[PDB]
Amino acid sequence: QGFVISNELRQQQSELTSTWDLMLQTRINLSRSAARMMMDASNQQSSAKTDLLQNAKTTLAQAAAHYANFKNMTPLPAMAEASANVDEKYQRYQAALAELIQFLDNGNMDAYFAQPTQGMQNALGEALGNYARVSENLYRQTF
Amino acid sequence: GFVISNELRQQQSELTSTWDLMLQTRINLSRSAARMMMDASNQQSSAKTDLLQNAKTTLAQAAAHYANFKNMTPLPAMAEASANVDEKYQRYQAALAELIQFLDNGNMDAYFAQPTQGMQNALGEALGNYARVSENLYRQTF
Numbered sequence: 001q002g003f004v005i006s007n008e009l010r011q012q013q014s015e016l017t018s019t020w021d022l023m024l025q026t027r028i029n030l031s032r033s034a035a036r037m038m039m040d041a042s043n044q045q046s047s048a049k050t051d052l053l054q055n056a057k058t059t060l061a062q063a064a065a066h067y068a069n070f071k072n073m074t075p076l077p078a079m080a081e082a083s084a085n086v087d088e089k090y091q092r093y094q095a096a097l098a099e100l101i102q103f104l105d106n107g108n109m110d111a112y113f114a115q116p117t118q119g120m121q122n123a124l125g126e127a128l129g130n131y132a133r134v135s136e137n138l139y140r141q142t143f
Numbered sequence: 144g145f146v147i148s149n150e151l152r153q154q155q156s157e158l159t160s161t162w163d164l165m166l167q168t169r170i171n172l173s174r175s176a177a178r179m180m181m182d183a184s185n186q187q188s189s190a191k192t193d194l195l196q197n198a199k200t201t202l203a204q205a206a207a208h209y210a211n212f213k214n215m216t217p218l219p220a221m222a223e224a225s226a227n228v229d230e231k232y233q234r235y236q237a238a239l240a241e242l243i244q245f246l247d248n249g250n251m252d253a254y255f256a257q258p259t260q261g262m263q264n265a266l267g268e269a270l271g272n273y274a275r276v277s278e279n280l281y282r283q284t285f
């Protein structure tokens with residue numbers, strides 16, 4: 001520990017980082033799945049793969065595993081605002097990604113491309129970037 | 144308060160940003176190639192050329208962050224060990240840049256055939272190894 005339980009803040013950032021990266025690979029997988037889905041316009045797309053969609057399911061499960069860990073460890077009262085905003089945000093992005101797997105799972109390319117996914121993602125990154133600031137800024141104080 | 148721990152955190156944020164932007168580049172490229180398969184009226188929604196262009200941009204910013212990282216160094220043995228991160232980054236960056244020209248030149252065969260995921264994994268580990276060595280090994284050793 002030390003700097004306001006430095007190790008703690010170090011572990012939470014590790015969990016959030018892995019959760020974040022894992023949600024990004026989930027989106028990559030969906031996308032690679034979608035691009036390969038041959039059912040568009042004047043083109044046969046590419047090697048029809050649903051394994052990639054299955055992968056998406058797995059990575060989202062893994063990201064959910066890490067967040068579950070971030071949520072069950074020594075919660076600091078000062079990080080209460082930052083942590084909740086991280087929750088307004090994670091639940092929305094995780095639900096966005098699942099609306100997507102559900103669309104690719106039923107051939108609903110109507111809804112898949114139309115979903116404003118990037119906005120949901122940015123909002124989480126903002127929340128995550130904010131958690132990082134709070135954990136250091138004026139939080140590195142007292143030692 | 145130490146020069147070592149402080150420069151280690153600074154480097155962690157530069158790498159995190161690089162990694163994120165390279166992941167963001169891959170996502171932008173993929174969304175373009177998907178939109179490139181049907182080409183259903185390119186516009187605000189079907190921002191295919193626009194996603195290809197954003198991919199060029201996020202990759203350029205990744206490059207910049209790495210610049211800051213390589214533009215500094217006080218740690219001895221660490222760097223020696225972590226020439227691994229540079230190798231893996233050198234590799235993955237070229238992979239992303241090549242996918243941009245394949246997509247740009249409409250070479251879909253080449254875009255899908257490239258073993259991108261293998262190169263990104265290699266980098267993610269190099270990064271996790273950097274953190275392994277930074278943590279304790281230096282975070283305690285000064």
Ligand SMILES: N[C@@H](CC(=O)O)C(=O)O
Pocket residue numbers: 027031112113114115116117118174177
């Ligand atoms: N809207 C979805 C699918 C797509 O546009 O390719 C996304 O942002 O991933």
Ligand SMILES: N[C@@H](CC(=O)O)C(=O)O
Pocket residue numbers: 032035169173242254255256257258259260
């Ligand atoms: N090989 C490229 C394109 C694709 O396979 O979707 C990638 O893995 O990003």
